[PDB]
C-alpha cells in the first residue's frame, strides 16, 4: 500500500528543483541531527583528518504531505528509488581530499510532510593546528555543514533541540592519538561576498595524553642532567673520570635528541 | 516565478557552444576573483602542493539578458540543473596528479546579462623549488588560469578590479612547513605554437621560520665546535683528557649529522 | 574596552552626499561584522545594511538598495557608509553598530557609536 | 512586508519584575527570527542585551534575561533598577533583514 501513496504524491505537479512553500514566505527550517561514527587518521602534517558519520536533516515539505492528520494511514512512508524529492543543497565548507562513494541513503516522508534524510559520508576536513605547547597542547577540529546555492531568505539549518552531536560507543578510546575531551555543537554563519548564508559547526577538542610522553621523552632526559652533576663531587685530580663523564653525557645526550 | 523566466531564455534560440557576441567583434571579456581556501602537503621532493580554492568568474551574455533595466524583476536569477550555459573552457596549465570530483557549483544570471560563475576545486600544482639556501630559502608557487580552445580573439581574462585574490581566515598559520609573506595577482598570458592565449597567475611566496631550524641544527653543533676548542687549553702532558676529547667530539658531530 | 567614535554631525543640501565615518578601538577589526541604523524623525529605528571587515562582501536592505554605500578601511580600523543623492528624507541621526561574533554572523547587537546626527535641508 | 509591535510604555519598581513583549505581524516569532534587544540611554546612547541563539553583550547584567513567553519575544528583568529606565528596542530577522519595532519606554519609578 505503500507504492500506491507514493504514486499519489508525484503524479502530481511535484518539481523537485523547486524549494518547498511557506506561510510566511520565509525560509525552509532545517533540522540537523548529526552522529559521530569513526575519527582516524589526524594527519598533523598535511593538516586534516579522516571522520566519518552519519547525517540526519528534517524539514517540512507541505507538497509531500499524504495522510496530514492520518492516523489511519501509515505515519511514514520509506521512498522508493524513483522518485525525486527536494532536499537542501547541503556541502561541507572545509571538506578536502574527498571522492564520494556512489547506497546508503534514507529518506521518510511522514503524514504530515515532515522529511527525514539519512546519510553515511566519509569525509577529509582541513584542520589547522597550533604546536606552541609540545607535546602537551589541545586541537579543536571542526565540521563545518551549510547549504551552496540557496541563501538565508531560501534555507536556514538549526542544531536538533536535543543531543545534536552524538558519537560512537567507543570514540574517545577509538582515536589512535589524540584522547577526546570535549564536543560542541554552534553556529557558524557567515557574510561572504555573495551572500548570508546559514551554517552549522561541530567541533571536537583533542589533547593528547601527558603520562606517555612524560615517561618516553622527560624524565630520561632528567636523568642525563643529573648525570653531569656528578662530576662535581669527584675530586680535580681524577681527570679519566670526570672527561668520560662530560663527554658520555652529552653523546648520550645528542643520540637522546637523535 | 524564478522557474518562468528561466524557461523564457532557453524556450529560445540559445546556443551553449556559440561564444556570446560582442558589439565591436571583439573578445570576451571574462572577470575573475579568487579565494583560496586551504593550502597544505607542499611537497619539496615531488615538486607539487595541494591547494584548494574558490574560482568565481564573470562575463556579459546578452543572449540571457531577461529584465534589461528589470527595475520591476528580481536582480538576478539561479541557474537550476537542465540548462547549458556557455562558459569560458578555463582549464589550469600547471595542474597535475589531478582527479575531478562529481556538484559545489553556483550560476546566477544578472539581468543585463551578467552571468556570475562560482566552483570548488582541490588542485595539485607543480611548483619548481630551489635549496640553494637550506633552510633559510624562499619558494614562490602559483596557480596558472587560462583558455584552452578559445584564443586571444575570443576570451580575454582580467583579474577582477578589488581584491583578486582572497585568503581564508587563518592560511597563514594553517601552513605545516612554511610561512605565507606575500601574494600576488600578475598576467601570465603567452604567445604559443598554436596562439596567443590569455592567462592570469596568482601567486604566493613561503619562507620558513629561521628560529626552529637555528635551535634544532646550528646551535647544537656551535656547542660541539666550542667543545672541541677547551682540549687547546689542556696541558700536552694529559694524553687520556685530550684523546677523548678529541675522539669524541668527532663521534658526536658524527651522530649529529646523521 | 571597546570604543566606536563616528564623524561629527553634517549639514548639507538636498542632492548632495557624503560620508560618515566609524573608527574601531578596542578589539581585532576585521573580526566582527559592522551594521547601519537609520534613526528618523518620523519612523521608527530603520536598518540600513551590514558589512564584514574581513570579507569585504555587504547585504543591503531592499529599501536602501543605492542609497547607501558601505565600504571599509582594514589599515586605519574604520567603516564608512556613502549617502548618494540625499534629500529632506534623508535627514536623521545614523548609528554603526558591530556584530557580537567572532569572525561570524552571530545576528546579534553588540556595542554602538554615538552616532552622527545628519541634516539635510536646502 | 511586515511590522514589529511592541508595548507603548510600561511602568515598573524598583526590585521587582517587568517583562515587555514583541510581537510578530506575519506569525509567531520563532527561534528563526533572532529576537534582539536594545536599551537607549538618553542623549542616543545605545547597547544590546540579548540576540541570536542565546548570545548576550559582553557586560550586561544578570537581571536581563531572553525567552519567547506566548508566541513573541521576551525581555524579563528580575529585579530591575533605577538605571534601568530607558527606551527598549527589538529587532527581529525576517529572511534577509532586521525589522525593528516601535520600541517600549520603561519607567522605573526613582
Known amino acids: 500500500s505503500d507504492s500506491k501513496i507514493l504514486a499519489h504524491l508525484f503524479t502530481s505537479g511535484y518539481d523537485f528543483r523547486v524549494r518547498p512553500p511557506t506561510d510566511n514566505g520565509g525560509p525552509v527550517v532545517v533540522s540537523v541531527n548529526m552522529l559521530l561514527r569513526t575519527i582516524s587518521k589526524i594527519d598533523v602534517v598535511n593538516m586534516e583528518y579522516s571522520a566519518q558519520l552519519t547525517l540526519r536533516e528534517s524539514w517540512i515539505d507541505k507538497r509531500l504531505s499524504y495522510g496530514v492528520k492520518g492516523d489511519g494511514q501509515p505515519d511514514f512512508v520509506i521512498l522508493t528509488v524513483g522518485h525525486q524529492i527536494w532536499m537542501p543543497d547541503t556541502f561541507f565548507p572545509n571538506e578536502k581530499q574527498a571522492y564520494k562513494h556512489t547506497p546508503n541513503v534514507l529518506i521518510r516522508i511522514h503524514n504530515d510532510g515532515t522529511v527525514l534524510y539519512s546519510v553515511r559520508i566519509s569525509l577529509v576536513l582541513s584542520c589547522p593546528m597550533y604546536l606552541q605547547y609540545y607535546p602537551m597542547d589541545v586541537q579543536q577540529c571542526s565540521i563545518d555543514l551549510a547549504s551552496y546555492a540557496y541563501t538565508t531568505k531560501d534555507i536556514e539549518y538549526l542544531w536538533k533541540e536535543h543531543s545534536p552531536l552524538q558519537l560512537k560507543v567507543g570514540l574517545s578510546s577509538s582515536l589512535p592519538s589524540f584522547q577526546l575531551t570535549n564536543t560542541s555543537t554552534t553556529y557558524c554563519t557567515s557574510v561572504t561576498n555573495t551572500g548570508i548564508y546559514s551554517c552549522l559547526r561541530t567541533t571536537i577538542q583533542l589533547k593528547r595524553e601527558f603520562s606517555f610522553y612524560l615517561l618516553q621523552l622527560y624524565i630520561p632526559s632528567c636523568m642525563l642532567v643529573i648525570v653531569s652533576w656528578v662530576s662535581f663531587w669527584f675530586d680535580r685530580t681524577a681527570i679519566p673520570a670526570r672527561v668520560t663523564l662530560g663527554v658520555t653525557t652529552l653523546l648520550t645526550m645528542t643520540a637522546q635528541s637523535a | 516565478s524564478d522557474s518562468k523566466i528561466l524557461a523564457h531564455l532557453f524556450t529560445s534560440g540559445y546556443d551553449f557552444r556559440v561564444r556570446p557576441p560582442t558589439d565591436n567583434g571583439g573578445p570576451v571579456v571574462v572577470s575573475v576573483n579568487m579565494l583560496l581556501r586551504t593550502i597544505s602537503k607542499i611537497d619539496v621532493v615531488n615538486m607539487e602542493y595541494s591547494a584548494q580554492l574558490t574560482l568565481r568568474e564573470s562575463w556579459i551574455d546578452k543572449r540571457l539578458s531577461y529584465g534589461v533595466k528589470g527595475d520591476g524583476q528580481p536582480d538576478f536569477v539561479i541557474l537550476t540543473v537542465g540548462h547549458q550555459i556557455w562558459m569560458p573552457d578555463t582549464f589550469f596549465p600547471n595542474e597535475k596528479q589531478a582527479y575531478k570530483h562529481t556538484p559545489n557549483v553556483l550560476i546566477r544570471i544578472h539581468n543585463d546579462g551578467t552571468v556570475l560563475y562560482s566552483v570548488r576545486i582541490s588542485l595539485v600544482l607543480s611548483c619548481p623549488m630551489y635549496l640553494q639556501y637550506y633552510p633559510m630559502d624562499v619558494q614562490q608557487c602559483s596557480i596558472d588560469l587560462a583558455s584552452y580552445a578559445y584564443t586571444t580573439k575570443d576570451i580575454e581574462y582580467l583579474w577582477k578590479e578589488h581584491s583578486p585574490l582572497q585568503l581564508k581566515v587563518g592560511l597563514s598559520s594553517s601552513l605545516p612547513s612554511f610561512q605565507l609573506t606575500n601574494t600576488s595577482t600578475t598576467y601570465c598570458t603567452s604567445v604559443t605554437n598554436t596562439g596567443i592565449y590569455s592567462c592570469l597567475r596568482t601567486t604566493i611566496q613561503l619562507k620558513r621560520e629561521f628560529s626552529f631550524y637555528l635551535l634544532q641544527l646550528y646551535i647544537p653543533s656551535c656547542m660541539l665546535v666550542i667543545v672541541s676548542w677547551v682540549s687547546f687549553w689542556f696541558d700536552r702532558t694529559a694524553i687520556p683528557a685530550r684523546v677523548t676529547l678529541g675522539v669524541t667530539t668527532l663521534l658526536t658531530m658524527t651522530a649529529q649529522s646523521a | 574596552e571597546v570604543q566606536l567614535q563616528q564623524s561629527g554631525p553634517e549639514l548639507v543640501r538636498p542632492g548632495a552626499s557624503m560620508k560618515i565615518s566609524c573608527k574601531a578601538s578596542?578589539?581585532?577589526?576585521?573580526?566582527?561584522?559592522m551594521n547601519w541604523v537609520k534613526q528618523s524623525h518620523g519612523k521608527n529605528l530603520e536598518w540600513i545594511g551590514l558589512?564584514?571587515?574581513?570579507?569585504?562582501?555587504?547585504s543591503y536592505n531592499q529599501k536602501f538598495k543605492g542609497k547607501a554605500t558601505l565600504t571599509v578601511d582594514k589599515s586605519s580600523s574604520t567603516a564608512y557608509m556613502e549617502l548618494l543623492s540625499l534629500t529632506s528624507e534623508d535627514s536623521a541621526v545614523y548609528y554603526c553598530?558591530?556584530?557580537?561574533?567572532?569572525?561570524?554572523?552571530?545576528?546579534?547587537?553588540?556595542?554602538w557609536g554615538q552616532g552622527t546626527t545628519l541634516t539635510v535641508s536646502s | 512586508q511586515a511590522v514589529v509591535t511592541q508595548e507603548s510604555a510600561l511602568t515598573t519598581s524598583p526590585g521587582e519584575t517587568v517583562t515587555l513583549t514583541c510581537r510578530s505581524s506575519?506569525?509567531?516569532?520563532?527561534?528563526?527570527?533572532?529576537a534582539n534587544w536594545v536599551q537607549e540611554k538618553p542623549d542616543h546612547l545605545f547597547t544590546g542585551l540579548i540576540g541570536?541563539?542565546?548570545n548576550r553583550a559582553p557586560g550586561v547584567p544578570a537581571r536581563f534575561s531572553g525567552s519567547l513567553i506566548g508566541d513573541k519575544a521576551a525581555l524579563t528583568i528580575t529585579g530591575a533598577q533605577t538605571e534601568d529606565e530607558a527606551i527598549y528596542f527589538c529587532?527581529?530577522?525576517?529572511?534577509?533583514?532586521?525589522?525593528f519595532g516601535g520600541g517600549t519606554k520603561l519607567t522605573v519609578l526613582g
Open positions: 553598530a558591530r556584530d557580537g561574533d567572532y569572525y561570524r554572523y552571530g545576528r546579534y547587537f553588540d556595542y
Open positions: 578596542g578589539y581585532s577589526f576585521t573580526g566582527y561584522t
Open positions: 558589512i564584514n571587515p574581513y570579507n569585504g562582501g555587504t
Open positions: 506575519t506569525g509567531a516569532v520563532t527561534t528563526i527570527n533572532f
Open positions: 541570536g541563539i542565546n
Open positions: 529587532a527581529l530577522w525576517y529572511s534577509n533583514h532586521w525589522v
